Design a protein around this ligand. Structure first.
Ligand SMILES: CC(C)(COP(=O)(O)OP(=O)(O)OC[C@H]1O[C@@H](n2cnc3c(N)ncnc32)[C@H](O)[C@@H]1OP(=O)(O)O)[C@@H](O)C(=O)NCCC(=O)NCCS
Lengths: 157, 273, 92, 271, 184
């Protein structure tokens, strides 16, 4: 049950892992796209407790929540429909499976380099069963000008 | 100049929420100092503004002030007062002596308010009854924090406890945790008369009740303020007055440098290291 | 009898006699309940006794001032006992 | 047992005068806590009992409480608040953070109340006129402690200063040193408009006036309390409120460990 | 003079075991100060006497002194140095400034030595292998304390670590926990 439209001007995403520069570049892209609200709703980082990381929306400082567990981010943000997965090759599989355990996510972007092929095939199988679009591993992501940017595509501003 | 024209972006490393001094008039948590003074909200109100960012009701502020009054000092024999007195007799300034006294405040000294509040809150939030709480505490091998007095008992109550209890009863809207603590107290006094609710225990339970029932707080905010150490701050601020009084008293008395007697020290050293 | 003995055991009595007892197809009728119970075990049967009363023995009613010593008897673990026969006497 | 029988002499190594906890009643300077509470002696009255061993009049206690409230906090940019915030963001407990903030209170930060009180008392007691005092400070290369603001000059007075000064003028019996300070203030504001009496200077002079004219003190006692550092204690007790508020605030915000940026540090090492 | 006769018992309220100054010579944990200096026990030897009441071997004392040298300072930007600098610029004396800096030392600043020691000791005392330890730390969402530097990596050694580790390998009799940490 894959969707034709993956990104839009209202698409909100969850970033797995602390990628401050990538999220800030996403927000800068969002601001120069005249987007109403930021596309990064929350971040997931297992190694710290819940807090709020401060980013820039244009010239004004804003707070984006950072959750230790993905479940908290999923519960507190039902509007998120994309997850850019910044886990390493040893953590991309488990994080992606846990994400596919949540039905609100329609698209997952995997940035990790060097996933074993069998694990990737299992990811594809579960994505096909769940109807989730996977922007395959070993990628920078994608860009939809005016709507959404995945991580570090297009460089900086 | 670049920030004035807003062409450079730099993140702010600090975030504050209690006081604004940049503007014309000083602001205590969104409230100007003159509006603080014209509403007859004193030490308790200013403390509520600076610590909780709330305008507490008048009885809440008065209860906070009463708590500061009862914990102001408890003689020179305690660890903090002793350290303050020794630092003062060593010729140090007020800040050094006060700080030496304050740095003993923690688990064994000065932490009974926070510990009592935490223990009673954990007991009451669980569905266990006061008798089950007492039995669980006895089985766990730990004494109930906030129970037991030197010489006061039933038919000889602690006067600070009675004063605070009388106010909280007549002014606080609802005190479920205080009633729970009083049931635990009557159980323990049936066990042994001196096992009455302490000033620390009553202050802790009544402060939790004030946070949970004054209407200015949610359950999560009150729990967070208990966890952060608001009662540690209450005891520290109250006892700072007594420690400064001890410093001033030692300076007036012109007490000389103190050195502990050797007969009071047991010297047990290795034979030949 | 088994039920009565279980009641004896779990209510911590010491002396439990029925005189007389009536057994009938209708049921059982108790007419007198001669009973002495362990007062010191009150801390176990607080709920199971409610507000239990200990009547004084036969004789003169308890003095208003002796009852004050009786009340203070339970204030602490120390024992404080007083009993009167005839205040008119000289030896105290 | 020997002490109970009273056949052994050992002198006491400590002397105290402010609080007695041994007896059935807690006692603040010869006053039971019940009598403290039933006579409505609040924070100011307890402070007077514990610091000066006196029953100050009601207006003195209210003035002490107002002094505590006006010095409660002055934002996070000051040295003590900065250190308290940094210690709180380092994960330390309340006492450690409050202590780190308080330990910066002294000559350059916090000691303006005490310095202003000493300076104005020394000038007033010597008999020199305010113009002579201003000229004497100018020749010595010393700024008058308590004189100078950053923004507020004239027709926009410092509101804390106004509140305290109104209370002092309405409730104190006599304020000679305050009038001397206002004379000095008029001279210095004729010099340049922002040289107004600070909250520090006004608190110092009004505390001296209270401590000399409330009737509970002699001149020697008031001078001794000023010299020992009672106003340092006033500022410390007031600012402990704000420092604890800053600690609780940094704990609420869940701020991480602080690290000063390298661009703000000038590294000049020998070679 | 009642106590001299032995007519009175008064329990001692304090107990000490590190230093004795009552006698005609200063004693460090049973060892006279002249014997301390005669044996050429450095700062590390005195630290061993005062903290552990032990006559440590010479390499142990020198390693303690090296550890003190390494942790001597790490610039003005850290929390403790920042607080010391702020208090010094506020006109306070040496004790107040040093104390204001030291009171930041705790869980987030300055607690990495103790946290790393406790973590590696608890791992090594249990039977888990280094890989199991790494996976177990990862599962609980805990970073291994004592691992990770901002700019230094392999084929770019941290020089302080290199000096300390070279000394430890050269002079220590056995380093089981160091071997475990190097596998990790
Ligand atoms: C130790 C640990 C924090 C290092 O990870 P890290 O975040 O990469 O290291 P830093 O925090 O120093 O790096 C932050 C960046 O800001 C820079 N930076 C550090 N201090 C700075 C300052 N005062 N001003 C400006 N920039 C600074 C660093 O150079 C680094 O830049 P980079 O992009 O060139 O790497 C991390 O591995 C860890 O948490 N390990 C746990 C074990 C531990 O804590 N040990 C204690 C260390 S002694």
């Amino acid at each position: 049950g894959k969707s034709t439209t993956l990104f839009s001007r209202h698409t909100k995403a969850i970033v797995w892992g602390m990628q401050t520069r990538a999220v800030q570049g996403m927000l800068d892209f969002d601001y120069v796209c005249s987007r109403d609200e930021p596309s990064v709703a929350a971040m997931v980082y297992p190694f710290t407790g819940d807090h709020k990381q401060k980013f820039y929306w244009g010239h004004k400082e804003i707070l984006i929540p950072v959750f230790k567990n993905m479940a908290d981010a999923m519960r507190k943000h039902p509007e998120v429909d994309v997850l850019i997965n910044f886990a390493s090759l040893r953590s991309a599989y488990d994080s992606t499976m846990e994400t596919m355990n949540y039905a609100q996510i329609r698209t997952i972007a995997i940035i990790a380099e060097g996933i074993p092929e069998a694990l990737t095939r299992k990811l594809i199988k579960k994505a096909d069963q769940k109807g989730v679009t996977i922007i395959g591993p070993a990628t920078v992501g994608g860009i939809k000008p005016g709507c959404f940017k995945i991580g570090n595509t297009g460089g900086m501003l | 100049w670049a920030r004035e024209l807003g062409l450079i972006r730099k993140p702010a490393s600090f975030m504050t929420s209690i006081c604004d001094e940049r503007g014309q008039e000083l602001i205590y948590a969104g409230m100007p100092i003159t509006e603080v003074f014209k509403e007859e909200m004193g030490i308790g109100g200013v403390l509520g503004l600076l610590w909780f960012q709330k305008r507490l009701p008048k009885y809440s502020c008065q209860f906070i002030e009463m708590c500061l009054m009862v914990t102001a000092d408890h003689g020179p024999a305690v660890s903090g007062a002793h350290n303050t007195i020794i630092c003062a007799r060593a010729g140090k300034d007020l800040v050094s002596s006060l700080t030496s006294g304050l740095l003993t405040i923690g688990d064994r000294f000065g932490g009974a308010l926070d510990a009592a509040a935490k223990m009673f809150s954990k007991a009451f939030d669980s569905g266990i009854i006061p008798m089950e709480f007492v039995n669980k505490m006895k089985k766990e091998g730990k004494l109930i924090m906030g129970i037991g007095h030197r010489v006061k008992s039933i038919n000889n109550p602690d006067m600070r406890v009675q004063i605070l209890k009388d106010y909280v009863r007549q002014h606080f809207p609802a005190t479920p945790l205080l009633d729970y603590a009083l049931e635990v107290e009557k159980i323990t006094t049936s066990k042994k008369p001196n096992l009455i609710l302490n000033v620390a225990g009553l202050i802790g339970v009544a402060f939790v009740d004030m946070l949970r029932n004054c209407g200015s707080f949610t359950r999560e905010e009150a729990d967070e303020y208990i966890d952060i150490g608001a009662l540690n701050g209450i005891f520290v601020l109250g006892r700072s007055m007594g420690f400064i009084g001890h410093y001033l008293d030692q300076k007036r008395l012109k007490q000389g440098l103190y050195r502990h007697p050797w007969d009071d020290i047991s010297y047990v050293l290795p034979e030949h290291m | 009898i088994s039920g009565l003995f279980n009641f004896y055991e779990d209510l911590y009595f010491t002396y439990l006699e029925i005189n007389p007892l009536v057994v009938t197809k209708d049921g059982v009728y108790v007419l007198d309940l001669a009973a002495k119970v362990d007062a010191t075990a009150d801390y176990i049967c607080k709920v199971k006794w409610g507000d239990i009363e200990f009547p004084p023995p036969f004789g003169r009613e308890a003095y208003p001032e002796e009852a004050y010593i009786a009340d203070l008897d339970a204030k602490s673990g120390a024992s404080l006992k007083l009993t009167l026969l005839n205040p008119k006497g000289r030896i105290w």
